[PDB]
Amino acid sequence: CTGNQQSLAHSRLWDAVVGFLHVFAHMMMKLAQDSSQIELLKELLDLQKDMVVMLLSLLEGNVVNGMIARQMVDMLVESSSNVEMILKFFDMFLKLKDIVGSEAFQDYVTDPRGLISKKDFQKAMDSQKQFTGPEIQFLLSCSEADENENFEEFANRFQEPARDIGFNVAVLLTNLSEHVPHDPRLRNFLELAESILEYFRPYLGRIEIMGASRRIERIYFEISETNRAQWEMPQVKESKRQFIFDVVNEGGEAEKMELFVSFCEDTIFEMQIAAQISEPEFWGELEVQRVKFLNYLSRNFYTLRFLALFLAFAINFILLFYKVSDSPPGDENMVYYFLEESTGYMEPALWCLSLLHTLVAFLCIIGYNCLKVPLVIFKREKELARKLEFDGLYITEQPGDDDVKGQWDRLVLNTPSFPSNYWDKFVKRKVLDKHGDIFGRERIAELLGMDLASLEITAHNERKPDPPPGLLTWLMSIDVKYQIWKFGVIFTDNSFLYLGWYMVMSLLGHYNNFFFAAHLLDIAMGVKTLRTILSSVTHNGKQLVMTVGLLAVVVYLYTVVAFNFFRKFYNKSEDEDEPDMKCDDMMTCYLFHMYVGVRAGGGIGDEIEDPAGDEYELYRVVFDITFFFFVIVILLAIIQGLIIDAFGELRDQQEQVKEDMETKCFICGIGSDYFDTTPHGFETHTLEEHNLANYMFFLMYLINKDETEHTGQESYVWKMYQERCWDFFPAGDCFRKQYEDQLS
Amino acid sequence: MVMSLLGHYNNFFFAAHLLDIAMGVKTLRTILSSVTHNGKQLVMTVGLLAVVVYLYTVVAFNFFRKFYNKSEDEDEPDMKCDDMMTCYLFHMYVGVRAGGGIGDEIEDPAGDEYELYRVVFDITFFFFVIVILLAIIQGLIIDAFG
Amino acid sequence: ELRDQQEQVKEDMETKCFICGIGSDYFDTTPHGFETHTLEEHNLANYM
Amino acid sequence: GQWDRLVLNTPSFPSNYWDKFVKRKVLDKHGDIFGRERIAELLGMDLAS
Ligand SMILES: Nc1ncnc2c1ncn2[C@@H]1O[C@H](COP(=O)(O)OP(=O)(O)OP(=O)(O)O)[C@@H](O)[C@H]1O
Ligand SMILES: Nc1ncnc2c1ncn2[C@@H]1O[C@H](COP(=O)(O)OP(=O)(O)OP(=O)(O)O)[C@@H](O)[C@H]1O
Ligand SMILES: [Ca+2]
Ligand SMILES: [Zn+2]
Numbered sequence: 005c006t007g008n009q010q011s012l013a014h015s016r017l018w019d020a021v022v023g024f025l026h027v028f029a030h031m032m033m034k035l036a037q038d039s040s041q042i043e044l045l046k047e048l049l050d051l052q053k054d055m056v057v058m059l060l061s062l063l064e065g066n067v068v069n070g071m072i073a074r075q076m077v078d079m080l081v082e083s084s085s086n087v088e089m090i091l092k093f094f095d096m097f098l099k100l101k102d103i104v105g106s107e108a109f110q111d112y113v114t115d116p117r118g119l120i121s122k123k124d125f126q127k128a129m130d131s132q133k134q135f136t137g138p139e140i141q142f143l144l145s146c147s148e149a150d151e152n153e154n155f156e157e158f159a160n161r162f163q164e165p166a167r168d169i170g171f172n173v174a175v176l177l178t179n180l181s182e183h184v185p186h187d188p189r190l191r192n193f194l195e196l197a198e199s200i201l202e203y204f205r206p207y208l209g210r211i212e213i214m215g216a217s218r219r220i221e222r223i224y225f226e227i228s229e230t231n232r233a234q235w236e237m238p239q240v241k242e243s244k245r246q247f248i249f250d251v252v253n254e255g256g257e258a259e260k261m262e263l264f265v266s267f268c269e270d271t272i273f274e275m276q277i278a279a280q281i282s283e284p285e286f287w288g289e290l291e292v293q294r295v296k297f298l299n300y301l302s303r304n305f306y307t308l309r310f311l312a313l314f315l316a317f318a319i320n321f322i323l324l325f326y327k328v329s330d331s332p333p334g335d336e337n338m339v340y341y342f343l344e345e346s347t348g349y350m351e352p353a354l355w356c357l358s359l360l361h362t363l364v365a366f367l368c369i370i371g372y373n374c375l376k377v378p379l380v381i382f383k384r385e386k387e388l389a390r391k392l393e394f395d396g397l398y399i400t401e402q403p404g405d406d407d408v409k410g411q412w413d414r415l416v417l418n419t420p421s422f423p424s425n426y427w428d429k430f431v432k433r434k435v436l437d438k439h440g441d442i443f444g445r446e447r448i449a450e451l452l453g454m455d456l457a458s459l460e461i462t463a464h465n466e467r468k469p470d471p472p473p474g475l476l477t478w479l480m481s482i483d484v485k486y487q488i489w490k491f492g493v494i495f496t497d498n499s500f501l502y503l504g505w506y507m508v509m510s511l512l513g514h515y516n517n518f519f520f521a522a523h524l525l526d527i528a529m530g531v532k533t534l535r536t537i538l539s540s541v542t543h544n545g546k547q548l549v550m551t552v553g554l555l556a557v558v559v560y561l562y563t564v565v566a567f568n569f570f571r572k573f574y575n576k577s578e579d580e581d582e583p584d585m586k587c588d589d590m591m592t593c594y595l596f597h598m599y600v601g602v603r604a605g606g607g608i609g610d611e612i613e614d615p616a617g618d619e620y621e622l623y624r625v626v627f628d629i630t631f632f633f634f635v636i637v638i639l640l641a642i643i644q645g646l647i648i649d650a651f652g653e654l655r656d657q658q659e660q661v662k663e664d665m666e667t668k669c670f671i672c673g674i675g676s677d678y679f680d681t682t683p684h685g686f687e688t689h690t691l692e693e694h695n696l697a698n699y700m701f702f703l704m705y706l707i708n709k710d711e712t713e714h715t716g717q718e719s720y721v722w723k724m725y726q727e728r729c730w731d732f733f734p735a736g737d738c739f740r741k742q743y744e745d746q747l748s
Numbered sequence: 749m750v751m752s753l754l755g756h757y758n759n760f761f762f763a764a765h766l767l768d769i770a771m772g773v774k775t776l777r778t779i780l781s782s783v784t785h786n787g788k789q790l791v792m793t794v795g796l797l798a799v800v801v802y803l804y805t806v807v808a809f810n811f812f813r814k815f816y817n818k819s820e821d822e823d824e825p826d827m828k829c830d831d832m833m834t835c836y837l838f839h840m841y842v843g844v845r846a847g848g849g850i851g852d853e854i855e856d857p858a859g860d861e862y863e864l865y866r867v868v869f870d871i872t873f874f875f876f877v878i879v880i881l882l883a884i885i886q887g888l889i890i891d892a893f894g
Numbered sequence: 895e896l897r898d899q900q901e902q903v904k905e906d907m908e909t910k911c912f913i914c915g916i917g918s919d920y921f922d923t924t925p926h927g928f929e930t931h932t933l934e935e936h937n938l939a940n941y942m
Numbered sequence: 943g944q945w946d947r948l949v950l951n952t953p954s955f956p957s958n959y960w961d962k963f964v965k966r967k968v969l970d971k972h973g974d975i976f977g978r979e980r981i982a983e984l985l986g987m988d989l990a991s
């Protein structure tokens with residue numbers, strides 16, 4: 005609001021804040037003495053947060069040189085006897101936490117039992133050049149010598165209260181430093197503020213946005229410790245690779261990054277379900293047992309999946325030492341048995357290993373039910389909710405009546421527990437609000453089920469009823485339609501069916517007609533390079549299958565020509581007692597040209613008897629030459645040439661993605677060459693302005709933060725996120741093209 | 749130096765110098781460097797050859813034992829698939845390094861049951877191991893050299 | 895080569911206006927700028 | 943990195959390099975933070991006094 009902001013610029017508020025800034029710094033250092041006034045210190049620092057956020061809101065929407073930031077630095081330099089010392093309290097208190105436990109000085113002979121006296125660190129700090137002047141004496145004075153007649157108590161309590169204000173003042177100085185350069189009075193302060201500033205470097209994310217002014221402006225925020233650690237886990241790290249490959253490889257520009265917001269949206273679900281499982285620090289007592297057991301599966305799912313390889317390779321090593329004999333050891337008397345090299349442990353070992361392999365496979369499928377099934381259900385639930393809210397896929401227009409996905413989704417609409425895993429439990433009530441007046445709302449209640457649709461007006465408005473629970477409620481408190489829908493989608497995806505395929509040969513493997521080895525082939529998909537090979541065959545399935553058909557027909561013409569004319573030549577020797585002419589029948593001849601024919605160098609002519617100048621000599625020699633000229637050296641080379649080229653293409657696509665990312669900004673459309681006009685310009689640019697994680701962190705605390713506490717720019721983003729309009733992203737400018745003439 | 753000092757023994761091992769001395773040529777050096785340029789992918793692919801052939805050996809051991817028999821004037825105990833080690837090595841030596849796949853060396857199925865089951869075995873073997881997968885092994889480092 | 899020519903035609907149409915000589919990158923400076931542009935201004939049927 | 947640890951204690955470390963003063967430069971730089979005597983232990987510094 006330019007009016008209110010401009011009015012406050014010319015008011016007496018500058019005088020007020022400088023008075024506050026002077027008085028705040030004095031009593032807080034006075035109040036730190038003896039720790040009696042810590043409650044008041046909490047209140048003062050808590051109010052200082054409210055002071056700084058007022059200043060930040062004043063700074064919102066400014067020009068690079070708007071004269072409000074200029075007035076702000078004029079206020080600040082007028083407080084030059086005060087803005088330094090307020091920073092120095094944080095400087096000392098951060099630095100001592102760094103210094104303690106990071107040198108030779110420790111507990112040592114003062115008190116190993118954690119009851120150190122006053123002289124524990126009297127002038128150990130004096131060796132360091134960090135503290136000088138009366139500051140070291142001030143720390144000694146502020147050293148609460150309680151029970152003089154501690155490292156773990158002195159520095160400990162001054163971390164929780166001072167966190168927020170230190171981050172906020174760091175934000176203010178950082179934003180001011182970027183907004184108005186060529187202000188050397190401001191440049192003095194950042195040397196003093198360097199320690200606290202670099203401490204909050206991991207927890208100061210930075211975002212560029214656009215909208216409402218056709219201008220780029222920065223945003224600053226806090227990040228939780230746990231979420232920063234959670235994103236760095238290997239599972240989410242892998243999922244980043246899987247998403248980022250697809251959208252850059254084939255996604256269009258318009259649909260480039262609705263998928264990206266969707267990826268962020270369900271990526272939140274990944275940390276949530278991962279946050280439930282943890283290393284956490286009698287019917288009633290059974291629940292804790294099953295919860296601990298299933299969570300133990302959920303953490304180490306990939307590890308036991310790798311264990312299946314060791315079981316498979318080890319059992320298949322024992323599969324070699326076999327023999328057969330005319331009789332059992334001591335005419336339809338085959339006997340399969342071992343040939344162990346003078347050691348009897350192998351035969352018991354095979355039974356033991358088989359039992360273990362079956363068990364660990366069952367562990368894989370149970371853990372996969374716990375872990376990834378929530379995510380795929382989340383995807384389908386989100387698809388139905390967004391499509392119903394913003395479109396008429398089941399109310400305005402039916403589907404195409406060919407896609408099974410749309411038809412199978414029809415059943416869950418009537419159920420009451422439809423948005424089980426999705427966040428919002430109100431989409432059913434939103435669609436009737438939108439498409440209520442056009443269509444019959446009662447019919448719409450029929451489409452959604454809407455159990456007690458009349459009660460939906462006052463389901464939880466008139467009162468909040470709550471009848472009690474009971475035992476064995478699970479046997480009659482489950483929606484059968486919803487569960488059937490769940491099982492259908494769970495069986496539809498490829499990944500779960502692969503585990504079931506593993507299970508069928510695993511259970512059948514205890515029969516052990518050598519079929520343990522079938523696991524060993526397709527288990528090796530986990531290698532990326534090997535997986536590309538198997539994917540290459542189906543990459544050109546249509547073209548390949550048509551080409552194999554043309555092989556099947558072009559050879560068939562040669563067979564009928566041979567059947568008419570060249571019957572006498574095809575004769576395998578039997579010492580002149582040969583009824584083995586293999587072209588007295590079309591099925592025999594056609595199969596002969598497959599087995600003995602194409603899979604042989606030189607074509608047919610190698611195997612058939614030589615034409616010894618016995619009529620049709622030229623007619624025969626052209627037959628073999630034209631056969632070899634068409635089927636083998638040309639057409640079979642097409643069959644070879646298709647997928648090998650495809651394999652090269654797929655490898656080139658992967659390398660293309662990796663090269664394309666480095667040479668072009670992902671979010672912003674600007675190429676890397678513009679940012680290559682500075683040392684580390686592109687690297688710093690993609691590090692901070694478009695980090696690709698800070699945006700994901702941006703969407704999180706917006707969900708976590710209360711609606712009343714949203715700032716101006718924060719609420720500006722959140723409104724469009726509800727409305728699903730992806731315009732506020734920059735898409736052409738990155739705070740530098742706007743201000744290229746003045747300065748970055 | 750080691751082969752040089754050992755060469756005074758002179759069990760023909762002077763010739764080992766002659767191979768790797770020719771690295772000084774640039775064009776020749778590129779050839780030797782090309783093999784290790786894609787070592788990871790090559791080694792994984794050779795592993796897939798080793799396993800995809802192993803499935804064919806166990807299928808043959810169950811069903812097609814009678815066919816594998818080298819002639820000894822009807823005094824032949826030389827059935828080379830009465831033992832998995834023998835059969836698996838047979839598919840390496842006599843098998844992959846031969847045009848047309850396995851079917852050239854084995855006795856012809858003379859309409860003696862499992863005819864379609866046998867003809868598909870040799871065709872699918874030749875269709876996967878030789879004309880495709882071995883061509884991948886050839887195609888990797890030649891592309892790397894380019 | 896022939897397969898590459900067919901794919902070349904399909905890729906060349908998307909990255910360049912057919913009737914007008916202007917490349918698609920100029921109309922890519924708006925959401926759906928090229929798509930709306932080729933939808934209405936040069937539809938290839940409306941001329942017929 | 944592990945194999946390079948041994949040469950630090952030796953006196954004739956910069957035998958072939960030009961500068962024979964890097965041992966004296968690092969203690970000037972990182973002297974006040976860490977214990978300079980411990981730094982003499984890291985570099986050897988025969989007769990550090
Ligand atoms: N917003 C972005 N704009 C442009 N490039 C980006 C963006 N985010 C990431 N990148 C690029 O993606 C890659 C980042 O990789 P990632 O964050 O996965 O780190 P890593 O696991 O250490 O691996 P690597 O950097 O080798 O890919 C770098 O090429 C970086 O330039
Ligand atoms: N005047 C034009 N200028 C530029 N591109 C055009 C023009 N007319 C058509 N195109 C492009 O040609 C294609 C139009 O295809 P067509 O009208 O045959 O529709 P379709 O049968 O649904 O198939 P498809 O869009 O997949 O080719 C799109 O790539 C469109 O961008
Ligand atoms: Ca508010
Ligand atoms: Zn960017």
Ligand SMILES: [Zn+2]
Pocket residue numbers: 911912913914915935936
């Ligand atoms: Zn046009």
